[PDB]
Symmetry: C3
Amino acid sequence: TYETILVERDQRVGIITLNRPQALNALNSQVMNEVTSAATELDDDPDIGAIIITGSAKAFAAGADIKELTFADAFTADFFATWGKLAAVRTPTIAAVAGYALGGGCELAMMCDVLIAADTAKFGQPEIKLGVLPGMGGSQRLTRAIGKAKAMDLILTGRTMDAAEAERSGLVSRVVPADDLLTEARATATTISQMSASAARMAKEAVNRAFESSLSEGLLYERRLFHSAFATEDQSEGMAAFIEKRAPQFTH
Amino acid sequence: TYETILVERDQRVGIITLNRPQALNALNSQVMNEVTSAATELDDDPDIGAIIITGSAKAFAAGADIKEMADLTFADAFTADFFATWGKLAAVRTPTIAAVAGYALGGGCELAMMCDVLIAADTAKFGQPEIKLGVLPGMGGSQRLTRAIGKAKAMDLILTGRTMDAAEAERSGLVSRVVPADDLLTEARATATTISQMSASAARMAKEAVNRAFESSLSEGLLYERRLFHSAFATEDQSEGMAAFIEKRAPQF
Amino acid sequence: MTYETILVERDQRVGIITLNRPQALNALNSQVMNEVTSAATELDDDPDIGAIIITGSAKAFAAGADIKEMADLTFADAFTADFFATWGKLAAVRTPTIAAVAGYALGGGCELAMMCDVLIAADTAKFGQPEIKLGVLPGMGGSQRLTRAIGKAKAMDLILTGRTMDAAEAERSGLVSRVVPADDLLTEARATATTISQMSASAARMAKEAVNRAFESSLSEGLLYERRLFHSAFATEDQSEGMAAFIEKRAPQFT
Ligand SMILES: CC(C)(COP(=O)(O)OP(=O)(O)OC[C@H]1O[C@@H](n2cnc3c(N)ncnc32)[C@H](O)[C@@H]1OP(=O)(O)O)[C@@H](O)C(=O)NCCC(=O)NCCS
């Protein structure tokens, strides 16, 4: 029973679709609570190996909500902090983005590991116009993704960036025609969910390390996890499969 | 009144123009000082919401006065803290725009990278040719260029002295936008006007949030952004921008 | 020295390391690791070298770490050996290094090209990190250096699906310095290394070190580091001659 999102299970893949189409999938408290509860639930399920978050063909998400007062009221509630539950998900996540990914919507797309964007996708941080700052990690994930000159530009002017520019700048994984987004997301998700669940979780964690410490510490952390792969059924099977020219049979 | 620069005020936008055309706006101690003095004064002016730095159509700034460095000892360099004054530019809280035409080489490329937004004419040529004269970047290029375009390309430019055109700079992350050379200055005004018409406060907080992404872990940067986000619901200006949007009218910050 | 898995040539101020395991697509075993590091290290120590190129064949730069070596590794073997640690000797090399990448550079092959300073690629180049699906994850720095080079969404894409990236995407994403036609790769790399090896030795070493800094600390720190390094340059003879020469409209004669 979710009011603003739909949740579907398809083999080892779970899909969260933002289901508030009238508001152009605007993000609010409730959306935040539901999206985060469903992903956490899918993370805990051993029969799931990839999570998709998507919106409509018109809008991944058009922004935050505007009706949604003190500083203490914001400090005490930790307004937006719950979004952090999306980043704490261990199972790989995939943002399938069509049309408007603006404000929070752009920031949600950025919280996922992999970002497959439609033909029609448009990204932006236009809340400077309302005299509002990003509160979902936009000034943080945007800059690390596309670099300073473009990050500043988008954040201070509110201009949009289309799919092609997001692809050449480092914002997206790959671009696909709009009609094919959901099938390309699912096929991508499917491929990842068929990997060893341990290896996929390890690989994702090692990559995330790239923004949390110096290169020397990241290199060390990666090398250590890599040695740990060797204590697993799946490293042995995966490599045995290569040498015996056969499909690998993972029990994750 | 300045010797190597011109300064112009038009509405809420400031424009610093390098004025050594004979020398292609090559940077020297005097230029460094003036730009910093002008930048700082525009930043302190409450009727200023954005600053432009530009040169001429031929060169933003191509190289530096090498005579001022030829006979420097380590001791003179360390004592003068040679180049440190340029840090005053990065410490400016108001958004800065580099409008780069033609050559932005050595110091000039480093000067462009210090600004927040980088608007390039299709004529812009970027490069760090220092290596040739037996030195390395001295004004943050090894740090800013690498962060903008990645190790592979930054190693290439700094170790060979090769130039990179406006288009390669756009795809690799160095510039915000490329515009035709003839539109360069007008386009910088347009972008500066837009920025200068934002809440001065919000625009400064946003710039400060962005700059944090180069100074700590994502984890830390996220927390800093959230705290500062909450602080902008305090402030009058967020009521006006909000009412403006509901009433489909322009905000009067 | 005398090597099994690599070839080593020196010409004027440029040394070239060519990977030589063609029966296994230059797959990287411990033998290759040790030989590449020892060669690079001893070239770095030679005063008559100014640049080092690492390359493979037209068909594969390297198609990974050697899987047969890894298949029969136990956790104890890997932890005891600190498996892969030794590649760090290459990153410690002071002379500028150039990766010249034709064909496959996947897994440790991609990782190896990423350890170099400059990456010149053939139009024919194919990058990837398909370790996932062997039941592992990059063990030679790919999750770190790839992400940093090309950004999260693309590094996550490659590392979790193990898809390949062609030279043109690599070039536009920040992974390589330049692409050239495959036939010109070796000619080009060699021209690049000539230019670098003719520069001042100290300047090129300082500059390489300063760039590397930019991944190791915050920006404030790197900036202070670069500037201090810049000031030391004023004690170098090559600064003097490099600047003297420029002023006199002549070519520098580095002693
Ligand atoms: C690159 C590749 C696609 C092209 O292969 P190909 O053209 O079909 O050629 P082959 O597989 O015959 O080519 C190579 C052979 O060289 C060996 N080889 C290739 N890559 C190897 C590797 N990484 N480790 C050990 N041997 C390797 C093969 O085992 C085979 O040897 P064999 O003849 O003695 O059995 C393929 O060899 C491959 O993908 N290998 C593994 C890549 C990988 O997963 N890398 C890193 C993640 S852990």
